[PDB]
């Protein structure tokens, strides 16, 4: 599906450089679902943060493919003492400082890196959130990145992937230079990283016309 790997990455970088650093820019015209998205994410995550036996901590989270901080602002900062962000697009990290407002003072690092080149620091994160970005990595780079994420989790920490699933196979989007993979492909890549699947949910009440969205909690 991906013929030229260098062009797969360079075309995506070029695409994102000219997108407006706004919520509707992040979501490709679907800004009107942002809060519906975040509310489901919060319910999916909060189970793991409950006092419980092996509770996931609330000290630090990493937001991967964070953009301007849409998720950091309304999902992660209210739940974690500190948040780090990583994104390839410099204009989005610059805008995040303004978009996040006062509570953005609790964002520690604004890492500018492609996930395929990024190593999260060992024993650093209670939650690593990876939303709407796995389609920008090749299958091998995705598996390798997920393995590096596993090494950066604190005790009881989790990785969450939330993304679009194709009906069947792998579909390349030539506009933004990303792939949409079917559920069985995604589950296979997750397993290959040595991650166990702890929770899984298809999101409800999104628009009829978009691909299904699944969330996976992993460790």
């Amino acid at each position: 599906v991906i013929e030229d790997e260098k062009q797969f990455y360079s075309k995506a970088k070029t695409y994102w450089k000219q997108i407006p650093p706004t919520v509707d820019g992040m979501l490709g015209g679907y800004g009107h679902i942002s809060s519906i998205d975040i509310n489901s994410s919060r319910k999916f995550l909060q189970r793991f943060l409950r006092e419980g036996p092996n509770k996931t901590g609330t000290s630090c989270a990493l937001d991967c493919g964070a953009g301007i901080g849409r998720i950091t602002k309304r999902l992660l900062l209210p739940l974690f003492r500190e948040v780090d962000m990583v994104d390839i697009t410099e204009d989005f990290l610059v805008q995040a400082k303004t978009y996040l407002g006062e509570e953005g003072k609790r964002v520690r690092n604004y890492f500018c890196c492609g996930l395929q080149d990024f190593t999260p620091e060992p024993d650093s994160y209670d939650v690593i959130w990876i939303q709407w970005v796995i389609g920008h990595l090749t299958d091998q780079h995705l598996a390798e990145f997920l393995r590096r994420c596993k090494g950066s989790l604190r005790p009881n920490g989790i990785i969450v992937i939330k993304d679009n699933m194709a009906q069947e196979g792998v579909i390349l989007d030539d506009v933004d230079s990303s792939v949409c993979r079917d559920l069985d492909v995604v589950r296979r890549i997750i397993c290959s990283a040595g991650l166990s699947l702890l929770a899984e949910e298809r999101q409800e009440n999104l628009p009829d016309e978009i691909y299904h969205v699944y969330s996976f909690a992993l460790r």
């Binding site: 992040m26 979501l27 490709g28 679907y30 679902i33 709407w132 679009n164 009906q167 579909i171 989007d173 949409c180 999104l206 628009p207 016309e209 978009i210 691909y211 969205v213």
Partner: peptide, 6 residues
């Protein structure tokens, strides 16, 4: 973000 089915 989300994607309209192609």
């Amino acid at each position: 973000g989300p994607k309209r089915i192609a």
